[PDB]
Design a protein around this ligand. Structure first.
Ligand SMILES: COc1ccc(C(=O)Nc2c(Cl)cncc2Cl)cc1OC1CCCC1
Ligand SMILES: [Mg+2]
Ligand SMILES: [Zn+2]
Length: 322
């Protein structure tokens, strides 16, 4: 059909920063995660490498995508697809050519796909403050991130969903550990330590990059997926602005729930006292730029255009304040 033709055209940009992910979400019948993951697996020849039956891959992806919430403005299947695609581009950076094994690549992409599954659209702190079942289950420690992993892995046990059925026991064990390490590293409470470790690696860099032990390799993959998670402000402005609209809607809905419960409204969650532009500038200045500038240093000069875009977008948001 004409719609499938346009979808195919948009997917030709799967290896490019700035893919039209929202268009792909609409054109695919709200299956951005499934089609983008399928496309990336085909591009990297992962189905052949790991003997993943095509029908099994699609069944699992659709099932996984179904577990992202349709009514959460930001932490939905589009965000998952975007992080998957951004990770895919970061993995292809020239400075990392031939550094990671096929299993490591698979782990990073799979981790990206499941990293926010079944997100309720409220933060770890909200879950902790409201004595939620999730916080009680996970003892207030990386509550959501533990849950995303539990769901992502559990779904593999559904009928015709085990995409790792042909991996060896050793490969399955290794992949499981890497995926857990990567998704737990997406908790923002770990951001400062992750960044500190990334800077230490840049300072002791040996060169393409030379990573010999699990600690260094996993650290890079953790930071890579974390960069993808924090990549919105580095994308072309039309995409960035949509991500900002969505995160603010989600935050405002949390603030509304907090207000209904008589709780104090969390930072940036009060629709009656918000500064969207100032908040984006602060977000870039204190979190996004420090991380991306460090990533850019590790893979210099591969990420120069991404960092330039980030800086341009920071200047644009800042210009709307006066
Ligand atoms: C497009 O703007 C934003 C996008 C993403 C996030 C953000 O914190 N994402 C995130 C969250 Cl909410 C939790 N764990 C990890 C990540 Cl990366 C935060 C954003 O803006 C901040 C939050 C509200 C205003 C500043
Ligand atoms: Mg998350
Ligand atoms: Zn995320």
């Amino acid at each position: 059909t004409e719609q499938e033709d346009v979808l195919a055209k948009e997917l030709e940009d799967v290896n490019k920063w700035g893919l039209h992910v929202f268009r792909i979400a609409e054109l695919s019948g709200n299956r951005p995660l499934t089609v983008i993951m399928h496309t990336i697996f085909q591009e990297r020849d992962l189905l052949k490498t790991f003997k993943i039956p095509v029908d099994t891959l699609i069944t699992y992806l659709m099932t996984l995508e179904d577990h992202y919430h349709a009514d959460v403005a930001y932490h939905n299947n589009i965000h998952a697809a975007d992080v998957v695609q951004s990770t895919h581009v970061l993995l292809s950076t020239p400075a990392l050519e031939a550094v990671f094994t096929d299993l490591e690549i698979l782990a990073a992409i799979f981790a990206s796909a499941i990293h926010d599954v079944d997100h309720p659209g409220v933060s770890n702190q909200f879950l902790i403050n409201t004595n939620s079942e999730l916080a009680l289950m996970y003892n207030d420690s990386s509550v959501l991130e533990n849950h995303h992993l539990a769901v992502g892995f559990k779904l593999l046990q559904e009928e015709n969903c085990d995409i790792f059925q042909n991996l060896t026991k050793k490969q399955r064990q290794s992949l499981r550990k890497m995926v857990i390490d990567i998704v737990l590293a997406t908790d923002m409470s770990k951001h400062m330590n992750l960044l500190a470790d990334l800077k230490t690696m840049v300072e002791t860099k040996k060169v393409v990059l030379l990573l010999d032990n699990y600690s260094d390799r996993i650290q890079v993959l953790q930071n890579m997926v974390h960069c993808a998670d924090l990549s919105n402000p580095t994308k072309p402005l039309q995409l960035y602005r949509q991500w900002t609209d969505r995160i603010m809607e989600e935050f405002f809905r949390q603030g509304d729930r907090e207000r209904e419960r008589g709780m104090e409204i969390s930072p940036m969650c009060d629709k009656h006292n918000a500064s969207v532009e100032k908040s984006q500038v602060g977000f870039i200045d204190y979190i996004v730029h420090p991380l991306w500038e460090t990533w850019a240093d590790l893979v210099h000069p591969d990420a120069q255009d991404i960092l330039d875009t980030l800086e341009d977008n920071r200047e644009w948001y800042q210009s709307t304040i006066p």
